[PDB]
mmCIF file of C-alpha atoms (C1' of nucleotides) and ligand atoms in Angstrom:
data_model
loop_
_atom_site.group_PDB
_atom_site.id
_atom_site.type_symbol
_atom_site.label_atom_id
_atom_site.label_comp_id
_atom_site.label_asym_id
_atom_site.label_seq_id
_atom_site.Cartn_x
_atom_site.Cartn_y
_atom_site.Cartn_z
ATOM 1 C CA UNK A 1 83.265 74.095 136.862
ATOM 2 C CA UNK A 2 81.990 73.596 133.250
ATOM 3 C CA UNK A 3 83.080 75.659 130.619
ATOM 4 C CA UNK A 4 80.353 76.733 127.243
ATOM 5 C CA UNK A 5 82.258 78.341 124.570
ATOM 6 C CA UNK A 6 80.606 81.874 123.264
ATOM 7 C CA UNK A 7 78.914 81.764 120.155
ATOM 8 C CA UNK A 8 80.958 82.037 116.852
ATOM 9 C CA UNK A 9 81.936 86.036 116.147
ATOM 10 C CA UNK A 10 82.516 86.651 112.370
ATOM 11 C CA UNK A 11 83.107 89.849 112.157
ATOM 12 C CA UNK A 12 86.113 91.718 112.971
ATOM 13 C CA UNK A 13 86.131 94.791 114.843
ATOM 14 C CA UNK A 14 86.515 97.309 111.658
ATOM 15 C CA UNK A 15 82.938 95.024 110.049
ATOM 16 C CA UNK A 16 85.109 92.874 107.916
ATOM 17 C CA UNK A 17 83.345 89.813 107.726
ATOM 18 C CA UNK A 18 85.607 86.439 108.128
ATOM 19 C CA UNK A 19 87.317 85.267 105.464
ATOM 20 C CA UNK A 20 88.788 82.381 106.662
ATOM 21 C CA UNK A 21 88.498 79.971 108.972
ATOM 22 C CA UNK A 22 91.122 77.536 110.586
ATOM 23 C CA UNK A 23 91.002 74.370 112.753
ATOM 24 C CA UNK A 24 93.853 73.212 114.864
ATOM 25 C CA UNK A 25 93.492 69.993 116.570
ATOM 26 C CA UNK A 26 96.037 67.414 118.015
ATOM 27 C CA UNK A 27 94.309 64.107 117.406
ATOM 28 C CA UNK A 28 96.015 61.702 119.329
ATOM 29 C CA UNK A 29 96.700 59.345 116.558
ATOM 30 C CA UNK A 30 95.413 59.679 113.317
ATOM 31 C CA UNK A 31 93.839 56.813 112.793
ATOM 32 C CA UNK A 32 92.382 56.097 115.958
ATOM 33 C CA UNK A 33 90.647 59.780 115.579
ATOM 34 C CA UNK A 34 89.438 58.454 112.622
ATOM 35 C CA UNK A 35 87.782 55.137 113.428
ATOM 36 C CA UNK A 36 86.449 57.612 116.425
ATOM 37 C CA UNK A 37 84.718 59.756 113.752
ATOM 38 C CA UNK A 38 86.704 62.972 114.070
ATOM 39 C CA UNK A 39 86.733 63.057 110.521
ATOM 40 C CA UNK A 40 83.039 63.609 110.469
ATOM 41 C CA UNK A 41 83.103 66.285 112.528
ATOM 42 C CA UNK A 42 86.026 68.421 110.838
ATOM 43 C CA UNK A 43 83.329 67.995 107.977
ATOM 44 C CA UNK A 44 80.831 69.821 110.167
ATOM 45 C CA UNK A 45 83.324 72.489 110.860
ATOM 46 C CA UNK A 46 84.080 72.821 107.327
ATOM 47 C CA UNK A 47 87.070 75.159 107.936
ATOM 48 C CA UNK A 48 89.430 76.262 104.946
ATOM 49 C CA UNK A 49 92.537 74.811 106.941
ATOM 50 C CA UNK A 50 92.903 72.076 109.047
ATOM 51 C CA UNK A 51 96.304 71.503 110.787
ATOM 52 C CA UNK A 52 96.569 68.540 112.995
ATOM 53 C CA UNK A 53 99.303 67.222 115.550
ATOM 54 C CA UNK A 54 100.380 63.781 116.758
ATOM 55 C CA UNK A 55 99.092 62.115 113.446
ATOM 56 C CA UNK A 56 101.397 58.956 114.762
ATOM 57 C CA UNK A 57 101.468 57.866 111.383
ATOM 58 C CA UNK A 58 103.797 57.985 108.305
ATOM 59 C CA UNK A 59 102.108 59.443 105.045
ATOM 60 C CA UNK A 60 102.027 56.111 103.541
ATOM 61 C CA UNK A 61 99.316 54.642 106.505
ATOM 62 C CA UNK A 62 96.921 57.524 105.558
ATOM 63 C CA UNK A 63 93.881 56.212 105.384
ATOM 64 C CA UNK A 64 91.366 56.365 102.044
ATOM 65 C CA UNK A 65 89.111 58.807 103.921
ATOM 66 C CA UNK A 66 91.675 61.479 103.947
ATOM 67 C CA UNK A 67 91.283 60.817 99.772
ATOM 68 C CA UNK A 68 87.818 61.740 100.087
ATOM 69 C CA UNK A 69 87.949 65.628 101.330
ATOM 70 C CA UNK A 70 87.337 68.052 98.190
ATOM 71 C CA UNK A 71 86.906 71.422 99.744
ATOM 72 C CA UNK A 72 91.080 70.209 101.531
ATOM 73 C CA UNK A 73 92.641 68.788 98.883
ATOM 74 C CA UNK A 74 96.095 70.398 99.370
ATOM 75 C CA UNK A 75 97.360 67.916 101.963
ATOM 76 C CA UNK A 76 101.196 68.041 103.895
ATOM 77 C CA UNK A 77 102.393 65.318 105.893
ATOM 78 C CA UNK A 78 105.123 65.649 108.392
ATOM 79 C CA UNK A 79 106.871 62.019 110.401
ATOM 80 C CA UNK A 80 109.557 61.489 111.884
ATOM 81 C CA UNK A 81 112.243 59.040 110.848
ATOM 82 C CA UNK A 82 112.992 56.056 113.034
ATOM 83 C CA UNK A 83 109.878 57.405 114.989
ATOM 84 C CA UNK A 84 107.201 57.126 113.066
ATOM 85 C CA UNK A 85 104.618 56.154 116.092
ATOM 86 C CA UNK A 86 105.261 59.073 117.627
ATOM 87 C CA UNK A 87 104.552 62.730 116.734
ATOM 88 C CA UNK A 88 103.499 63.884 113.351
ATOM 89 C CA UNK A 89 101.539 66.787 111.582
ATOM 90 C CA UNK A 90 99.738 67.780 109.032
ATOM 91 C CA UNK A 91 98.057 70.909 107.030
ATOM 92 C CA UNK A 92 95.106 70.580 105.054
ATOM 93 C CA UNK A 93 94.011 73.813 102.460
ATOM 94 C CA UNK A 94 91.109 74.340 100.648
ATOM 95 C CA UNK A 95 93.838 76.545 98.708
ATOM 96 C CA UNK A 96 97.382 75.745 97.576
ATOM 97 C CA UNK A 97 99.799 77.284 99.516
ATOM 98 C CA UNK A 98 102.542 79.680 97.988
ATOM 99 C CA UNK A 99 105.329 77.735 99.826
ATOM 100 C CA UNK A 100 105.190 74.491 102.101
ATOM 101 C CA UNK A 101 108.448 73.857 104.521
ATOM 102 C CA UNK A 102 109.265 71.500 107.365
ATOM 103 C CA UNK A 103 110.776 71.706 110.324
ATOM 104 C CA UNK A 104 112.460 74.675 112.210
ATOM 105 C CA UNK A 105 115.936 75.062 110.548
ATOM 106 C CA UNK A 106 117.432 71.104 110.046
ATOM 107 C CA UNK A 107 114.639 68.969 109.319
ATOM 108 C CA UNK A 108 116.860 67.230 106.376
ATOM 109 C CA UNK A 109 118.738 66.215 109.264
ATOM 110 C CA UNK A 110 116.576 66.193 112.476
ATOM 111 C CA UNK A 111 113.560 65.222 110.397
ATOM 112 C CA UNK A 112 111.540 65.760 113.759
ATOM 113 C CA UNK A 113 108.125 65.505 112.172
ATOM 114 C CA UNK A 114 106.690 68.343 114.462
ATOM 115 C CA UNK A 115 106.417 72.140 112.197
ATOM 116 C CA UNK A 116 105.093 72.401 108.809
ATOM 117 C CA UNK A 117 105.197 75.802 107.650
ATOM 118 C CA UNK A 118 102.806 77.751 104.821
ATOM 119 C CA UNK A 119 103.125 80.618 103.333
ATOM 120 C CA UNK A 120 99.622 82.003 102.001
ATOM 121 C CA UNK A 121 99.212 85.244 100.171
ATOM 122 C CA UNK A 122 98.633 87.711 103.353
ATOM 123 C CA UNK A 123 100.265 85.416 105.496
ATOM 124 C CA UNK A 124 102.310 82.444 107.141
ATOM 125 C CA UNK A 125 100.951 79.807 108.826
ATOM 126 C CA UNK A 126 102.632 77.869 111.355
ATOM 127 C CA UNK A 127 101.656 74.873 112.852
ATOM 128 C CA UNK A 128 103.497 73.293 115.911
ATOM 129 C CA UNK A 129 103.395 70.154 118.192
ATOM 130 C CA UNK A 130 105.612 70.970 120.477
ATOM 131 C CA UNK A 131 107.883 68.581 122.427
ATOM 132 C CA UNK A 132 106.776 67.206 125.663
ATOM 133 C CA UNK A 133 109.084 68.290 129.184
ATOM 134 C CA UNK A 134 108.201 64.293 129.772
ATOM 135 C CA UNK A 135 107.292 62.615 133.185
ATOM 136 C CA UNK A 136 109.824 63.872 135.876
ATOM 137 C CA UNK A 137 110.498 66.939 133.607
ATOM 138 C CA UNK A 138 113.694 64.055 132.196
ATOM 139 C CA UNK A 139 113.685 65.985 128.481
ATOM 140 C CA UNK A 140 112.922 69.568 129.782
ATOM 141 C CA UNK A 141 116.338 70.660 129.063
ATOM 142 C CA UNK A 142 115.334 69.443 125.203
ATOM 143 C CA UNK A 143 112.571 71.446 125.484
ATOM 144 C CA UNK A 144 113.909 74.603 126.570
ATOM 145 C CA UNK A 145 116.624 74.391 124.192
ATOM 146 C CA UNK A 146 113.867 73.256 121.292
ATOM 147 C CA UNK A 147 112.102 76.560 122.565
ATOM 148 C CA UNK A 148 114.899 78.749 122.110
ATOM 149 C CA UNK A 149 115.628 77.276 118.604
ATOM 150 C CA UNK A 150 111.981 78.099 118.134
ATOM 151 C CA UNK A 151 111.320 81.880 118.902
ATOM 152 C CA UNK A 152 114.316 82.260 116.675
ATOM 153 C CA UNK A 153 113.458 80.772 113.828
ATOM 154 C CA UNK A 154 109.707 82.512 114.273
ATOM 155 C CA UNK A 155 111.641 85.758 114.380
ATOM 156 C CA UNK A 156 113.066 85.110 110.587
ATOM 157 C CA UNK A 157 109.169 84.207 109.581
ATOM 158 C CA UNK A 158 107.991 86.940 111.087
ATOM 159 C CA UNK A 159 110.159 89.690 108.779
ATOM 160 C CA UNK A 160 107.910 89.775 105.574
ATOM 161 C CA UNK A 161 104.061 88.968 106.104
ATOM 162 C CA UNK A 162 102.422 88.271 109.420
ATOM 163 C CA UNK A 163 102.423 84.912 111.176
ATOM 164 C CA UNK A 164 99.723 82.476 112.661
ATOM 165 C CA UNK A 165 101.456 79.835 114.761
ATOM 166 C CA UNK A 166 98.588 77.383 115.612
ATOM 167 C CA UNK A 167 99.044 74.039 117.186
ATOM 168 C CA UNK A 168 99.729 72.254 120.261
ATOM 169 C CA UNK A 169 102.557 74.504 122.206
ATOM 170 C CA UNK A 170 102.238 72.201 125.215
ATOM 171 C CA UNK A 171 102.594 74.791 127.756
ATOM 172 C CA UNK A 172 99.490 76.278 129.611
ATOM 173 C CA UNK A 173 100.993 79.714 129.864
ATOM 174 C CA UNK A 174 99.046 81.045 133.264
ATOM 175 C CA UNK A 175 97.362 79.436 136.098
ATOM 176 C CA UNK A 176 94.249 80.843 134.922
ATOM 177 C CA UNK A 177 95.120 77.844 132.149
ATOM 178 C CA UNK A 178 94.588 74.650 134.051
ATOM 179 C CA UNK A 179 92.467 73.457 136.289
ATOM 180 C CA UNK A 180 95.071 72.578 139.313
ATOM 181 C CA UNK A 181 97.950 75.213 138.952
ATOM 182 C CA UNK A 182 99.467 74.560 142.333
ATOM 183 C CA UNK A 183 99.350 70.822 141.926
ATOM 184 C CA UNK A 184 101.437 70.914 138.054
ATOM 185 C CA UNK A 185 104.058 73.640 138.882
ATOM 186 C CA UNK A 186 106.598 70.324 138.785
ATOM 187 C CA UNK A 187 104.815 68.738 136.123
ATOM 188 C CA UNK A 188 105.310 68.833 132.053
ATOM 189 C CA UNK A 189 103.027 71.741 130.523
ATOM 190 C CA UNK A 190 103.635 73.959 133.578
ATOM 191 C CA UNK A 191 106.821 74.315 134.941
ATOM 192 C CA UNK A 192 108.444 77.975 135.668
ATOM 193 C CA UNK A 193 110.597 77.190 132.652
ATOM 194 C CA UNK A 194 107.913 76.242 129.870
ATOM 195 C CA UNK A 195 105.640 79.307 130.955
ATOM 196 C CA UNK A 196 108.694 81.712 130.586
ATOM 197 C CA UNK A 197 109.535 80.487 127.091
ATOM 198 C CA UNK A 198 106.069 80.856 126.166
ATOM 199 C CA UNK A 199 106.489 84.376 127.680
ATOM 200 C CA UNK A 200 109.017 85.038 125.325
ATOM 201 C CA UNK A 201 107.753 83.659 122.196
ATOM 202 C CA UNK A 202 105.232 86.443 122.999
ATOM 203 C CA UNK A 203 107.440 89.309 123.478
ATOM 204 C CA UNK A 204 110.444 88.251 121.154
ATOM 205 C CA UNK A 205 108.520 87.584 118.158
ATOM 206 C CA UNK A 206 105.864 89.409 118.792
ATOM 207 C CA UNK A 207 102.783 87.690 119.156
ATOM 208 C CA UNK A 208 99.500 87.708 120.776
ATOM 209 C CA UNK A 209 97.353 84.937 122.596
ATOM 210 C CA UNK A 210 94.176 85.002 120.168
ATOM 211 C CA UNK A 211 92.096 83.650 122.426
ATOM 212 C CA UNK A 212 92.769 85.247 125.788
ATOM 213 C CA UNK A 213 93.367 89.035 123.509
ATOM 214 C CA UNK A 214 89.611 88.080 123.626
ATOM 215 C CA UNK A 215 88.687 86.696 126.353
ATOM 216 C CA UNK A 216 91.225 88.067 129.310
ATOM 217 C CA UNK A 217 89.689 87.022 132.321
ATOM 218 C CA UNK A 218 87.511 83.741 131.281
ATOM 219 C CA UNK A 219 88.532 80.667 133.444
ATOM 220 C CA UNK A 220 88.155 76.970 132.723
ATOM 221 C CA UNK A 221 88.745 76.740 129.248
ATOM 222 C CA UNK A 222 90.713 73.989 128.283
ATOM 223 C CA UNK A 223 91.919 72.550 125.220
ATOM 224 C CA UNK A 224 93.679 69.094 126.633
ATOM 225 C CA UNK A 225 91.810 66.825 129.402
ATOM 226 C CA UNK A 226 93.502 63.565 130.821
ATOM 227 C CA UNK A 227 92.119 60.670 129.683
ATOM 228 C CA UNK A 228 92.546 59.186 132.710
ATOM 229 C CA UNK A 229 90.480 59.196 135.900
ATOM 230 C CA UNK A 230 87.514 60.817 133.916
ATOM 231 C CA UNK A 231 89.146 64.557 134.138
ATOM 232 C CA UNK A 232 87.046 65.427 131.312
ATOM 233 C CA UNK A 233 83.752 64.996 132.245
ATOM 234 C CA UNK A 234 85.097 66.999 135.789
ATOM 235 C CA UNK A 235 86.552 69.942 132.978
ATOM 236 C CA UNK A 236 89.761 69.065 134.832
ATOM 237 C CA UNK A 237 91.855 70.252 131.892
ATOM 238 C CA UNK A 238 94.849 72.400 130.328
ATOM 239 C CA UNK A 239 94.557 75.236 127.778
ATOM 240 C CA UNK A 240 97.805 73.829 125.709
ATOM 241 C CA UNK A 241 96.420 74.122 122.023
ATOM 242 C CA UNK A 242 96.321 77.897 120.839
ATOM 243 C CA UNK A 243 96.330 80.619 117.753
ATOM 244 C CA UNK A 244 99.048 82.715 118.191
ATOM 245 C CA UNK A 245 99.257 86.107 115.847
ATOM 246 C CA UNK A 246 101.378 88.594 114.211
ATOM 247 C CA UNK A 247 100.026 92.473 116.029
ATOM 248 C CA UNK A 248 99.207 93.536 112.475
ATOM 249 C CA UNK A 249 96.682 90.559 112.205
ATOM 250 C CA UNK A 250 94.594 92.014 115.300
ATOM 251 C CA UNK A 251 92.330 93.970 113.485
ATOM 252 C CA UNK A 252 91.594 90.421 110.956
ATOM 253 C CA UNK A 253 90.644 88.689 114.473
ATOM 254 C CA UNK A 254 86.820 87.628 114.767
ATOM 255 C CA UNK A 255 87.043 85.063 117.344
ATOM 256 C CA UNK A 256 89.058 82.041 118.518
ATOM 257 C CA UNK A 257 87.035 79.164 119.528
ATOM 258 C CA UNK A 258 87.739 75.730 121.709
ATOM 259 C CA UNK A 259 85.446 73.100 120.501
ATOM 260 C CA UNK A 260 84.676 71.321 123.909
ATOM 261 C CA UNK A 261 82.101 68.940 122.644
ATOM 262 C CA UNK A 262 84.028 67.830 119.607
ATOM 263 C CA UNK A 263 85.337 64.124 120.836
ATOM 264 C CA UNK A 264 88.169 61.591 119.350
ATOM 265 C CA UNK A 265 91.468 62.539 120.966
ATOM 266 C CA UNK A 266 92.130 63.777 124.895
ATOM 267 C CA UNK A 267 92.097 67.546 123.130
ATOM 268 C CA UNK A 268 89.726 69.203 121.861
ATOM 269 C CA UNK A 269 89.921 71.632 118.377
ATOM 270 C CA UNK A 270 90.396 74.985 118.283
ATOM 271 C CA UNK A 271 89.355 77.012 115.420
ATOM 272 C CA UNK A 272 89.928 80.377 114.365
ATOM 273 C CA UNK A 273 88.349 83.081 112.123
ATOM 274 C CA UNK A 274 89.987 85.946 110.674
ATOM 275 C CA UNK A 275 88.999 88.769 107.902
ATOM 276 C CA UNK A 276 91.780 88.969 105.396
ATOM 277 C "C1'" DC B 1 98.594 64.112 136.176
ATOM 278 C "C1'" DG B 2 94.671 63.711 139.247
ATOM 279 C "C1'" DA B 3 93.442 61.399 143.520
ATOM 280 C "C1'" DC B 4 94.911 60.720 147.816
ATOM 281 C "C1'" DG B 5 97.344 60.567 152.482
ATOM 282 C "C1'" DG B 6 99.611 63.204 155.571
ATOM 283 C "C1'" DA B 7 101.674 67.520 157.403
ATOM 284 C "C1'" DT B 8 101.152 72.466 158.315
ATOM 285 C "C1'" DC B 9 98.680 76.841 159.241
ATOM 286 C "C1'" DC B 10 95.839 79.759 162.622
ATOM 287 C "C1'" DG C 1 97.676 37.633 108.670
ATOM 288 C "C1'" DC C 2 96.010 38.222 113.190
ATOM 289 C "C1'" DT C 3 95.852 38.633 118.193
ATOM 290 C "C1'" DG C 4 97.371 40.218 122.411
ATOM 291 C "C1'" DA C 5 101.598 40.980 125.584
ATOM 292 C "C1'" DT C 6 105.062 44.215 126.341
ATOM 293 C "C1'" DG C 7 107.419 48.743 125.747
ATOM 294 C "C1'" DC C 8 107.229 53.552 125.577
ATOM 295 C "C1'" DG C 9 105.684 58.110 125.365
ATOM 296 C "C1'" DC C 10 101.769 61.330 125.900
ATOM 297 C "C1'" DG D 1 89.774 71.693 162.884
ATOM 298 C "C1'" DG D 2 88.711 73.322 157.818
ATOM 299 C "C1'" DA D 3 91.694 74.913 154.336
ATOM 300 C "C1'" DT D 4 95.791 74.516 152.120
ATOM 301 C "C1'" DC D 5 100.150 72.509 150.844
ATOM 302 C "C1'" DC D 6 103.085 68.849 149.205
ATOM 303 C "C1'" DG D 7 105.034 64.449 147.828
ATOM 304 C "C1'" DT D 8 103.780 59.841 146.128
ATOM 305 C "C1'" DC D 9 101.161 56.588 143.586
ATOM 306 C "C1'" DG D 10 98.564 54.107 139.891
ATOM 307 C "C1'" DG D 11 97.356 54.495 135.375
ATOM 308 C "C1'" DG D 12 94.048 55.606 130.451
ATOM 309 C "C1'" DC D 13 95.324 56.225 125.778
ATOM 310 C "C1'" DG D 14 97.712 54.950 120.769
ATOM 311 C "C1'" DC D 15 100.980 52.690 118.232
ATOM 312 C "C1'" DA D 16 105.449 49.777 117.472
ATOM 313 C "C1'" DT D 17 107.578 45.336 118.118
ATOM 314 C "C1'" DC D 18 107.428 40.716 119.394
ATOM 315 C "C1'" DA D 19 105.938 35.647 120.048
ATOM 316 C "C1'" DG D 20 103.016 32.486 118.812
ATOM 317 C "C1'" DC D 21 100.373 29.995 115.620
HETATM 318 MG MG1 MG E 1 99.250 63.900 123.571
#
DNA sequence: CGACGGATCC
DNA sequence: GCTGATGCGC
DNA sequence: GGATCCGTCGGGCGCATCAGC
């Protein structure tokens, strides 16, 4: 089945109008998504932060067009060392941030090129690209650890202002989150063990699912789709990209979109409006 | 990771 | 410098 | 004997490195 996102809600329930608006998308290579045009549409979007995962490229490679975006002009770049193909993020502000950090804890050592953090003046913003369970689950162990290491070092965020945690978290947390639960309970982005650290990053931290607080019983909408074997035209996709939000940002929530049309990558962006 | 072949359920 | 094969991970 | 379950299989994408010229 097809999926239409609702129309945009800017208001939040107590009338506050949105304030701000944030786009999360995992690209799939930076570059590629740009020569694809992706770039043209975050300029449609126009949000006041953009946060993107699996840039695949070291800040140096950047290309000119990234120069050429005056309502983002506060740009942080994330690699990894030895890696640089791989992973990578970045946060883009129409505003400059209070306080920029990388990594969850070690990144002077691990240098993992996968969290950049932001501190803003009602709140932190996280943004994540989580690491993959891999075919045959062979790094899942990694990831539950990485997980663990996670939700704890959310926890210390979360003791001053609230959080938004934003990015690809690789884990559809429910089978009302994919397309073929049964099929993917052995595979990466489903297993008993990535749901149930999800779980916990919701309970331990606390946070909320923005989108599904919203929308509690919608099916098919998916943030990731296969490039392979034409799953996106079928909608044959995983909700893995997602807003995540301190309990005391609730009443800021408008909405929390999925951008199905918006092409360039295998996902698709998510964007989110809050009043602050 | 979805498509597919083959086994199982009533 | 440039292409395309191969490797590797998503 | 249609629906469901389950294990196996082939493989689209982006980017690095390499050989060759
Ligand atoms: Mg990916």
């Amino acid at each position: 089945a097809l999926y239409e996102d609702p129309p945009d809600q800017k208001t939040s329930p107590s009338g506050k109008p949105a304030t701000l608006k944030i786009c999360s998308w995992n690209v799939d290579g930076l570059r590629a998504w740009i020569k694809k045009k992706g770039l043209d549409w975050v300029k449609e979007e126009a949000p006041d932060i953009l946060c993107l995962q699996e840039t695949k490229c070291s800040e140096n490679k950047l290309p000119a067009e990234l120069q050429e975006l005056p309502g983002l002009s506060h740009q942080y770049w994330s690699a990894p060392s030895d890696k640089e193909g791989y992973s990578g993020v970045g946060l883009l502000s129409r505003q400059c941030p209070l306080k920029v950090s990388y990594g969850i804890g070690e990144e002077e050592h691990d240098q993992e090129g996968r969290v950049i953090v932001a501190e803003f003046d009602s709140f932190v913003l996280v943004t994540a690209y989580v690491p993959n369970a891999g075919r045959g689950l062979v790094r899942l162990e990694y990831r539950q650890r990485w997980d663990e290491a996670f939700r704890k070092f959310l926890k210390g965020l979360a003791s001053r202002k609230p959080l938004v945690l934003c990015g690809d978290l690789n884990v559809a947390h429910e089978e009302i989150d994919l397309r073929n639960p049964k099929g993917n309970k052995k595979n990466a982005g489903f297993t008993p063990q990535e749901r149930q650290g999800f779980g916990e990053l919701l309970q331990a931290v606390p946070l909320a699912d923005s989108f599904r607080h919203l929308y509690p019983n919608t099916p098919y909408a998916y943030t990731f789709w296969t490039y392979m074997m034409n799953a996106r035209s079928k909608n044959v996709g995983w909700r893995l990209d997602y807003f995540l939000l301190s309990h005391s940002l609730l009443p800021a929530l408008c909405d929390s979109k999925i951008r199905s049309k918006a092409l360039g990558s295998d996902h698709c962006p998510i964007t989110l409006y809050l009043a602050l």
